[PDB]
Amino acid sequence: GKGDRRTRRGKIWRGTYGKYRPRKK
Amino acid sequence: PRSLKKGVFVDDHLLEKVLELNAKGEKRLIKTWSRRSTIVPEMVGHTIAVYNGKQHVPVYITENMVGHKLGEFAPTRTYRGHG
Amino acid sequence: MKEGIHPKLVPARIICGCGNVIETYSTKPEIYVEVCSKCHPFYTGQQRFVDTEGRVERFQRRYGDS
Amino acid sequence: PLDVALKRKYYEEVRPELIRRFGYQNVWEVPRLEKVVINQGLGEAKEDARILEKAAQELALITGQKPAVTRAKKSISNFKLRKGMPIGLRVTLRRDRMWIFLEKLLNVALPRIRDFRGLNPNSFDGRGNYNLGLREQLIFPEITYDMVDALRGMDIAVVTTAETDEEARALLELLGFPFRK
Amino acid sequence: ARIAGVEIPRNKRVDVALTYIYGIGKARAKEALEKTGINPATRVKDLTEAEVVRLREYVENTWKLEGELRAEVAANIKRLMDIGCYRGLRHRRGLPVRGQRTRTNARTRKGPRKTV
RNA sequence: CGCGGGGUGGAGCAGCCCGGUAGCUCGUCGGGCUCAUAACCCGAAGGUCGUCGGUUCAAAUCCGGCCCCCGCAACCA
RNA sequence: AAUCGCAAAAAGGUGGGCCCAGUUCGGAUUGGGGUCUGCAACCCGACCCCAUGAAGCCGGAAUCGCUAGUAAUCGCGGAUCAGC
RNA sequence: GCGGUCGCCUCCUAAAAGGUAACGGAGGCGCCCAAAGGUCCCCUCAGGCGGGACGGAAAUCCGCCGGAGAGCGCAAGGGUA
Ligand SMILES: [Mg+2]
Ligand SMILES: [Mg+2]
Ligand SMILES: [Mg+2]
Ligand SMILES: [Mg+2]
Ligand SMILES: [Mg+2]
Ligand SMILES: [Mg+2]
Ligand SMILES: [Mg+2]
Ligand SMILES: [Mg+2]
Ligand SMILES: [Mg+2]
Ligand SMILES: [Mg+2]
Ligand SMILES: [Mg+2]
Ligand SMILES: [Mg+2]
Ligand SMILES: [Mg+2]
Ligand SMILES: [Mg+2]
Ligand SMILES: [Mg+2]
Ligand SMILES: [Mg+2]
Ligand SMILES: [Mg+2]
Ligand SMILES: [Mg+2]
Ligand SMILES: [Mg+2]
Ligand SMILES: [Mg+2]
Ligand SMILES: [Mg+2]
Ligand SMILES: [Mg+2]
Ligand SMILES: [Mg+2]
Ligand SMILES: [Mg+2]
Ligand SMILES: [Mg+2]
Ligand SMILES: [Mg+2]
Ligand SMILES: [Mg+2]
Ligand SMILES: [Mg+2]
Ligand SMILES: [Mg+2]
């Protein structure tokens, strides 16, 4: 959920990047 | 958690007075206003008086307070329960 | 012992982090124990694995040189 | 079965190392093991015997003896309990059958205790006997985890012929008892 | 089958059945899988006794878990309190340790309301 | 000092026979409706049972002593 | 700076996994290890990673919004601004 | 008169046999048990200390100490391992 910083959707919500949402297009 | 490292920030005015107390070897009450700084292992055994905004509180020092700051031992609260 | 009303109790086998425990002498011969800490695994044969005592020491060395 | 690894280890290992350590003039003076009493305090079964037989089922499976069902000596309100009612389960295992039981207790059970850094070195009752309390009946090899319905431990009372527990300590030590020093 | 201390997981899957251990999360689990060379997709319900023992020894030896971990945590807290640390005397009062506002929404750490 | 009935949340009442769990109304507290208070609606807290001893496994409850309350009696003289 | 960069749009779409489980739901709290801004993150910053996994299974009396590209739902940007 | 009492058991009063009075000091009975009965065989308490998961003053267990202070359906007495 948008509150689980340990996931894709969570990371998007906060607007940041990391292991669970890497910067790679 | 928490971090800042690759610097380990400690104020001078006390660090100088702490060192100047190891050489000559003299342990005495040392008043400070710097709670922004880390502690020891060169202060271990000194009674530094930390400031809580109101007045200096004498704080014993042991080798397990090392990693922390000085303010963590001089609370700014005064609570004493409710009701 | 009284006749009937009893478990058989018979020479048995056993398994662990070790290899084998022939002794046994119990009902249901041949058993697979999670970890017999008698063979040498765990605490005895004081392994002290995943050793510790970071605490002071840890913040000490990342401090002496930071 | 009159072999048993521990029964062997007592005579040809423990017994001699005990003599040269205390200097027993006679042959009998040296501490022998006798009588190991296992007792489940089971108030858990106040008004339901159905749960008391499943326990006995279990106790005999790990010991090799059907246990006797103790009954309440007196009526004691506060926590129910009147002069009757099955309020406990107890079995007294002696020579041989005690040996095979005490062996698995050391080489399997205790090892399976979550945590465990040794048994209490103060449970000696002064006159040279040792008591210990277990917190669940799954640490014994005979138990399958799929036969349980609820966790219930027990009291274990080991009795020794040793007049002092200073000596009673050595016996249990040399037998392979994991003490917390 | 029993792994750390005890804790018997089962069915569902293998990468999740490891999470049910105290000290193991999505990472530490999904890692030891391809480090002991085993397929997570399968269920602990079915797997060679061999695979079973690679796990227990790997995991139970790689790090500390269940009892050992818990024991270390409560041990760090004891120190924080023992020393007079603010971060520590917020453990005596059972209040939120990391900043936050206690004027309100502090329940989780403060407990159900005691209306007055 | 005769006889009878009592004493239980803050108020007034049950529960005591027959043992084993204390209930009702009001009030109090928190929230709601209202511009607002009350009414009204939704929630919650609160009594060791006058007292000391006794009986029983267990006492508001059965038994005894003491202290208070109410009622009746104190006649021939 | 339509001539570079923030920039990935998100839901959607395809494929696959979970199979009703306080559960790969939910991410609170907490332990540990770090990054960055700033003279300085104890009180009092944000962020990452490991572990922890909380209350919550749809909310009493009450009560709000909205008539169409509206309500719902999805992401993006800006001001302030060292960071937040 | 009013009040209390009226038969039965226990204790004291009762003066070391029995018995013995008073509106003398205190309690209890108007049942109960098909086993709480007969016999044979076994068994021995209460407490106190130490020991032992959930067990707490006290549930069940082990150790030593424990002549009866326990128990004997209910009062008291006598009796009794
Ligand atoms: Mg949503
Ligand atoms: Mg999630
Ligand atoms: Mg200067
Ligand atoms: Mg905050
Ligand atoms: Mg009345
Ligand atoms: Mg009243
Ligand atoms: Mg009545
Ligand atoms: Mg009301
Ligand atoms: Mg109100
Ligand atoms: Mg009275
Ligand atoms: Mg009686
Ligand atoms: Mg009373
Ligand atoms: Mg007349
Ligand atoms: Mg951006
Ligand atoms: Mg819940
Ligand atoms: Mg989850
Ligand atoms: Mg559900
Ligand atoms: Mg309109
Ligand atoms: Mg935004
Ligand atoms: Mg900004
Ligand atoms: Mg009359
Ligand atoms: Mg006489
Ligand atoms: Mg006794
Ligand atoms: Mg005792
Ligand atoms: Mg005791
Ligand atoms: Mg008697
Ligand atoms: Mg009698
Ligand atoms: Mg008598
Ligand atoms: Mg007598």
From Swiss-Prot, chain A:
One family name in Pfam for this protein: Thx
GO molecular function (one): rRNA binding
Comp. bias regions, Basic residues: 1-12
Protein keywords: Ribonucleoprotein, Ribosomal protein, RNA-binding, rRNA-binding
InterPro entries named among the record's database cross-references: Ribosomal_bTHX, Ribosomal_bTHX/bTHXc/bTHXm
Residue numbers spanned by region Disordered: 1-25
Domain of life: Bacteria
GO cellular component, one term: ribosome
Biological role stated in the UniProt entry: Binds at the top of the head of the 30S subunit. It stabilizes a number of different RNA elements and thus is important for subunit structure.
Stated family: Belongs to the bacterial ribosomal protein bTHX family.
Subunit structure: Part of the 30S ribosomal subunit.
Protein name, per record: Small ribosomal subunit protein bTHX
Organism: Thermus thermophilus (strain ATCC 27634 / DSM 579 / HB8)
From Swiss-Prot, chain B:
Source organism of this protein record: Thermus thermophilus (strain ATCC 27634 / DSM 579 / HB8)
PROSITE patterns attached to this UniProt entry: RIBOSOMAL_S19
Pfam families in the cross-refs: Ribosomal_S19 (PF00203)
Protein name (record): Small ribosomal subunit protein uS19
The gene coding this protein: rpsS
Family note: Belongs to the universal ribosomal protein uS19 family.
The keyword Oxidoreductase appears for this protein: no
Keywords: Ribonucleoprotein, Ribosomal protein, RNA-binding, rRNA-binding
UniProt-listed Gene3D superfamilies: 30s Ribosomal Protein S19, Chain A
Oligomeric and partner information: Part of the 30S ribosomal subunit. Forms a loose dimer with protein S13.
One GO cellular component, as annotated: small ribosomal subunit
Function: Located at the top of the head of the 30S subunit, extending towards the 50S subunit, which it may contact in the 70S complex. Contacts several RNA helices of the 16S rRNA.
Biological processes per GO annotation: ribosomal small subunit assembly; translation
GO molecular-function terms, A-Z: rRNA binding; structural constituent of ribosome
Swiss-Prot record, chain C:
Residue spans crossing the bilayer: none
Cofactor requirements of the protein: Zn(2+)
Keyword Ribonucleoprotein found: yes
Listed GO biological process terms: translation
Record-level Gene Ontology MF annotations: metal ion binding; rRNA binding; structural constituent of ribosome
Gene3D superfamilies reported in the protein's UniProt record: Ribosomal protein L31
InterPro entries: Ribosomal_bL28/bL31-like_sf (IPR034704), Ribosomal_bL31 (IPR002150), Ribosomal_bL31_A (IPR027491), Ribosomal_bL31_sf (IPR042105)
Any one cellular-component term (Gene Ontology): ribonucleoprotein complex
Keywords, ordered alphabetically: Metal-binding, Ribonucleoprotein, Ribosomal protein, RNA-binding, rRNA-binding, Zinc
Binding-site residues, Zn(2+): C16, C18, C36, C39
Cofactor note: Binds 1 zinc ion per subunit.
Quaternary organization: Part of the 50S ribosomal subunit.
Family: Belongs to the bacterial ribosomal protein bL31 family. Type A subfamily.
Biological role: Binds the 23S rRNA.
NCBIfam families: L31, PRK00019.1, PRK00528.1
HAMAP family attached to this UniProt entry: Ribosomal_bL31_1
Protein name (record): Large ribosomal subunit protein bL31
From Swiss-Prot, chain D:
Pfam families hit by this protein: Ribosomal_L5 (PF00281), Ribosomal_L5_C (PF00673)
GO cellular component: ribonucleoprotein complex; ribosome
Keyword Cytoplasm part of the UniProt annotation: no
Annotated GO biological process: translation
Lineage top rank: taxon: Bacteria
UniProt keywords, alphabetically: Ribonucleoprotein, Ribosomal protein, RNA-binding, rRNA-binding, tRNA-binding
GO molecular function terms noted in the UniProt entry: rRNA binding; structural constituent of ribosome; tRNA binding
InterPro entries: Ribosomal_uL5, Ribosomal_uL5_bac-type, Ribosomal_uL5_C, Ribosomal_uL5_CS, Ribosomal_uL5_dom_sf, Ribosomal_uL5_N
Quaternary data: Part of the 50S ribosomal subunit; part of the 5S rRNA/uL5/uL18/bL25 (TL7) subcomplex; has also been isolated as a complex with 5S rRNA, bL25 (TL7) and DNA binding protein II. Forms a bridge to the 30S subunit in the 70S ribosome, contacting protein uS13; this bridge is straddled by the 5S rRNA. Contacts the P site tRNA.
HAMAP family (alphabetical): Ribosomal_uL5_B
Family stated for the protein in its record: Belongs to the universal ribosomal protein uL5 family.
Function text: This is one of the proteins that bind and probably mediate the attachment of the 5S RNA into the large ribosomal subunit, where it forms part of the central protuberance. In the 70S ribosome it contacts protein S13 of the 30S subunit (forming bridge B1b) connecting the head of the 30S subunit to the top of the 50S subunit. The bridge itself contacts the P site tRNA and is implicated in movement during ribosome translocation.
Protein name, UniProt field: Large ribosomal subunit protein uL5
